[PDB]
């Protein structure tokens, strides 16, 4: 009946309500070609979208519409929605309701503009905007627990206890997968593997997904890298060329735990989660320590849950029992939560309608959200 | 309609409940209404929006707690109606208000308007067959089995001393103060902020009570303890962060003896006990000195009775046998005597029936109590 | 007996010694 | 050794210094320690690597600013020692610490450990002959010339109302809340991210303070301003890029009156002013209402004094003469009174001498301040 559409900054995920996993999965990209006066043969698309842009990557200027969970170009975001509904899902938006997701502490105008596009342009019967962390917690099954959500757009934390979100203890963070990908691309240039153009941005992204892992101890990993060359793995590109890097596997995702490398002057993901828990009430800290949930693609590095356990225990008192909930399906946890929320019978009375939107306007969504 | 009557022992700190002819109250829980601070975004949360009893004790951090009674005087009448409804409801008693007669309790010399409005609640909103209101001192002596006795009690709200002699309560010898356990806990909180560790929220306030219950003692000589340097004992929170209490643990209960510390010139516990014996007649004084009974929670401090003896030795006439008695069950002494009073056959004569209340009104309730 | 709060070794009472 | 004594008006936001008997403090600079983010490659650069005062204000963007003092409680003691050393150095005062006595200032109801550590710094690291710690309320009344009146103050750290009647400060009626200018500036930043124009860096944080100082106002009726739609007035940043502020300008300083917005159940300024008057004895209340003195920078919002009076009219008893007075120099109120107090001949009796500290220790400082 209802459609769930997790508009992620990287991978735009979408499908149906009451499902195990999403059908439509693709990178939210809109590649426009090299505009030269020379002609093109047997016709082509003026602006590609999704997997088509990824396939024909070499030529196209890959521009993401969402930057840090914030929609910059709205015409680009409108084309991706259109690509999700008609091409991938093969179903009109007028029949099915549409669950959407944004990160917490976003601009207030973005929900209003997102909702305006759904009702005016797409003619949706009913829509809703949920917090990503709330859905990630709902996919995991627990009512209680903090959610250290981390995608390519935005890392953020939302502490919740017994089905009561703590909006003032929320802490949004500028560090994310895209900033890690840019950092890996820079340190690759330092060892003679220069990647300037946006076509190579996806190759270094794919290198980041495969090889990189979170260090248990950084100074120890740096010492072993200098001594031995067993850690130095090789990755072959789409092209037959193959490259080898030693230091850059553990050093790339260390930027999460040490933002000083990127030049952000912010708290690391390990202590940002701690600072979120300390901002909550003193009586409900034990359960937040016990249910330290992870979600998103930036939590898919091997050994990240072990590093979070080391750092949070180091920050917190010795008496506390720290525990990180790190499921196998944490990459697609936000969408799974939306599918379970859409499947419930209580959610049928929580939708916005066309008549309610015509009466109120875009400002009705802020009341419905939280 | 003479079913097994209910014994509701009221009080600002704790509210005891149960049936007549029992050894100990089965239903003891703290007297406050808890309502959630935060927003409930996620479904499957703690329903009701009003938390009383063990749910409120379990989920403190969510709830903005507020005490309905201050100094044995209910300020918020809607909150006490909800608590008395919760007492009767299926979560505690599992019985109707229509079946059983009610035994209510109040501190002496309280506002008569509050006693009238209490009766109005039990007769109109609840449909009670018969109500009876009684004193704390008379009930404490019922539990011990005595008739002669000065009852120095110290609850959360009120401290007072009613001198009874062979079943003759002297109303004009009653000495009362509005300085008690809550003010000592509030005074301890103020000291802890001066030490360093700040507590401000209402859920966060009950941690200070738990510190006061556990780690506090009364020094026999306070000037000697001042001149000496303390050891600074530790305490663990529900969070796990350690707190060095210091001299605030011994200086906190000095509010009971020196009420000039809070900045409110009253008599004090020891002076109230002496003044109650002095205001009574000449021949009754020596019997009243021999029978001094203790009750309430703020008599449970370490070295309380030892210091209360020494203060009586300082004030009272020389070469007189002082005996400050104090049963094992001091906290439930008032409830036990009510259960004993309810079980006796004379109880039927003392109460105010619903028919008598409908005919006369408030005047009949004022006549039957005294 | 059963219930949360009790005091162990305070004694029932504190009494002054009786002289002749 | 009785030289012209130094006044050091301590504060979280701003620190003000000079000598006794002067009309206005000559040396007003912000209380923080800027340290450079970027690496210094080229020679002939800014030397020292620890920036305090006008150099730090001039070169914001280079320096990672961090405040040592939060809520009148120094966390980083090494930074405050460097600030006090910078005050005494040739860049500001051009004097030795050994010659002059010191008048330090602190907020009421602070941690006593900070007061001892403050004294240790002045007596041992600096070699001060005599030190004296005083309250902000008592000094503000010295500046005006009065003895009676409540002193409502609101700087960057603390908001506290001290009722003083004819040279008698009542310590048990001193109300305090940790909801001052810094929390308002932090709440404004969070609102500007909701508007769209996000700020994250520490040098970039002081732009929000400049926005808070310039373009903000406290409305009389907040519900009426919520129903009406704002005009979205502009403000130009130090760069040049314009910012449409919107409803974030007026809802930001509402935090001072409504502390539930940030997520911390406290009194608020208007409740603290009433509560301080109500905690005092009956006969002094009407004189305390007639004499209300404002102070600090967070009382300088547009329509603040008008809102304070409306809130006092709502809470306080009817038909009572309310009068909220203030000095012309509200920021320099506490320093001028200290300079007056220092120049008095009695000041010699009040202070803690170096010899007295070496003999006794912390006890003599706790005996002389209060």
TrEMBL record, chain A:
<keyword id="KW-0963">Cytoplasm</keyword>
<dbReference type="GO" id="GO:0097433">
    <property type="term" value="C:dense body"/>
</dbReference>
<keyword id="KW-0206">Cytoskeleton</keyword>
<keyword id="KW-0488">Methylation</keyword>
<dbReference type="GO" id="GO:0005524">
    <property type="term" value="F:ATP binding"/>
</dbReference>
<dbReference type="InterPro" id="IPR004001">
    <property type="entry name" value="Actin_CS"/>
</dbReference>
<keyword id="KW-0558">Oxidation</keyword>
<protein>
    <submittedName>
        <fullName>Actin gamma 1</fullName>
    </submittedName>
</protein>
<comment type="similarity">
    <text>Belongs to the actin family.</text>
</comment>
<keyword id="KW-0067">ATP-binding</keyword>
<dbReference type="GO" id="GO:0005829">
    <property type="term" value="C:cytosol"/>
</dbReference>
<dbReference type="Pfam" id="PF00022">
    <property type="entry name" value="Actin"/>
</dbReference>
<dbReference type="InterPro" id="IPR043129">
    <property type="entry name" value="ATPase_NBD"/>
</dbReference>
<dbReference type="InterPro" id="IPR020902">
    <property type="entry name" value="Actin/actin-like_CS"/>
</dbReference>
<dbReference type="GO" id="GO:0005925">
    <property type="term" value="C:focal adhesion"/>
</dbReference>
<dbReference type="InterPro" id="IPR004000">
    <property type="entry name" value="Actin"/>
</dbReference>
<keyword id="KW-0547">Nucleotide-binding</keyword>
<dbReference type="GO" id="GO:0005856">
    <property type="term" value="C:cytoskeleton"/>
</dbReference>
<dbReference type="GO" id="GO:0005886">
    <property type="term" value="C:plasma membrane"/>
</dbReference>
């Amino acid at each position: 009946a209802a459609l769930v559409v997790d508009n992620g900054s990287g991978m735009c995920k979408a499908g149906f309500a009451g499902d195990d996993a999403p059908r439509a999965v693709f990178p939210s990209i809109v590649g426009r070609p090299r505009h030269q006066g020379v002609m093109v043969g047997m016709g082509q698309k003026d602006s590609y979208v999704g997997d088509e842009a990824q396939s024909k990557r070499g030529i196209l200027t890959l521009k993401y519409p969402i930057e840090h969970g914030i929609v910059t170009n709205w015409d680009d975001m409108e084309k991706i929605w259109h690509h999700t509904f008609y091409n991938e899902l093969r179903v009109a938006p007028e029949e099915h309701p549409v669950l959407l997701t944004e990160a917490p502490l976003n601009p207030k105008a973005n929900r209003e503009k997102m909702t305006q596009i759904m009702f005016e342009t797409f003619n949706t019967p009913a829509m809703y905007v949920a917090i990503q962390a709330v859905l990630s917690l709902y996919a995991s099954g627990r009512t209680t627990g903090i959610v250290m959500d981390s995608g390519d757009g935005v890392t953020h934390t939302v502490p919740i206890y017994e089905g009561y979100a703590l909006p003032h203890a929320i802490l949004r963070l500028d560090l994310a997968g895209r900033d890690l990908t840019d950092y890996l691309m820079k340190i690759l240039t330092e060892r003679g593997y220069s990647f300037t153009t946006t076509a190579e941005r996806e190759i270094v992204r794919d290198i980041k997904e495969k090889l990189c892992y979170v260090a248990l101890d950084f100074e120890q990993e740096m010492a072993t890298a200098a001594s031995s060359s067993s850690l130095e793995k090789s990755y072959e590109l789409p092209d037959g060329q193959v490259i080898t890097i030693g230091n850059e596997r553990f050093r790339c995702p260390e930027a999460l735990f040490q933002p000083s490398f990127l030049g952000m002057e912010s708290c690391g993901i390990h202590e940002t989660t701690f600072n979120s828990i300390m901002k909550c009430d003193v009586d409900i800290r034990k359960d937040l320590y016990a249910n330290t949930v992870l979600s998103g693609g930036t939590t898919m590095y091997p050994g990240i849950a072990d590093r979070m356990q080391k750092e949070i225990t180091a920050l917190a008192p010795s008496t506390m029992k720290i525990k990180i909930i790190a499921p196998p399906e944490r990459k697609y946890s936000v969408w799974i939560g939306g599918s379970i929320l859409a499947s419930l019978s209580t959610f049928q009375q929580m939708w916005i309608s066309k008549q309610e939107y015509d009466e109120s306007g875009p400002s009705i969504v802020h009341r419905k959200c939280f | 309609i003479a079913n097994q009557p209910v014994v509701i022992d009221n009080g600002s700190g704790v509210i005891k409940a149960g049936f007549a002819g029992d050894q100990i109250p089965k239903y003891c829980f703290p007297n406050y209404v808890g309502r959630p601070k935060h927003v409930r975004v996620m479904a499957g949360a703690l329903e009701g929006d009003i938390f009383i009893g063990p749910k409120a004790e379990e989920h403190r951090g969510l709830l903005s707690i507020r005490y309905p009674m201050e100094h044995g005087i209910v300020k918020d009448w809607n909150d006490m109606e909800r608590i008395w409804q919760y007492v009767y409801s299926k979560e505690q008693l599992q019985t109707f208000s229509e079946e059983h007669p009610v035994l209510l309790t109040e501190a002496p010399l309280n506002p008569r308007k509050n006693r009238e409005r209490a009766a109005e609640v039990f007769f109109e909103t609840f449909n009670v067959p018969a109500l009876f209101i009684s004193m704390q001192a008379v009930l404490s002596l019922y539990a011990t089995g005595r008739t002669t006795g000065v009852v120095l009690d110290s609850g959360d709200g009120v401290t007072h001393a009613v001198p009874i002699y062979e079943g003759f309560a002297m109303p004009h010898s009653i000495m009362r103060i509005d300085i008690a356990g809550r003010d000592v806990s509030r005074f301890l909180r103020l000291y802890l902020r001066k030490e360093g560790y700040d507590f401000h929220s209402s859920s966060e306030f009950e941690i200070v009570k738990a510190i006061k219950e556990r780690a506090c003692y009364l020094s026999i000589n306070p000037q000697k303890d001042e001149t000496l340097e303390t050891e600074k004992a530790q305490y663990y929170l529900p969070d796990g962060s350690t707190i060095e209490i210091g001299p605030s643990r011994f200086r906190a209960p000095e509010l009971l003896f020196r009420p000039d510390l809070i900045g409110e010139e009253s008599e004090g516990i020891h002076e109230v006990l002496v003044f109650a014996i002095q205001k009574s007649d000449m021949d009754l004084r020596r019997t009243l000195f021999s029978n001094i009974v203790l009750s309430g929670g703020s008599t449970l401090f370490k070295g309380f009775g030892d210091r209360l003896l020494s203060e009586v030795k300082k004030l009272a006439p020389k070469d007189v046998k002082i005996r400050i008695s104090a049963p094992q069950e001091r906290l439930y002494s008032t409830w036990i005597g009510g259960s004993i009073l309810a079980s006796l056959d004379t109880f039927k004569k003392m109460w105010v029936s619903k028919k008598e209340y409908e005919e006369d009104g408030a005047r009949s309730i004022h006549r039957k109590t005294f | 007996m059963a219930d949360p709060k009790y005091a162990d070794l305070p004694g029932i009472a504190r009494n002054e010694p009786d002289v002749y």
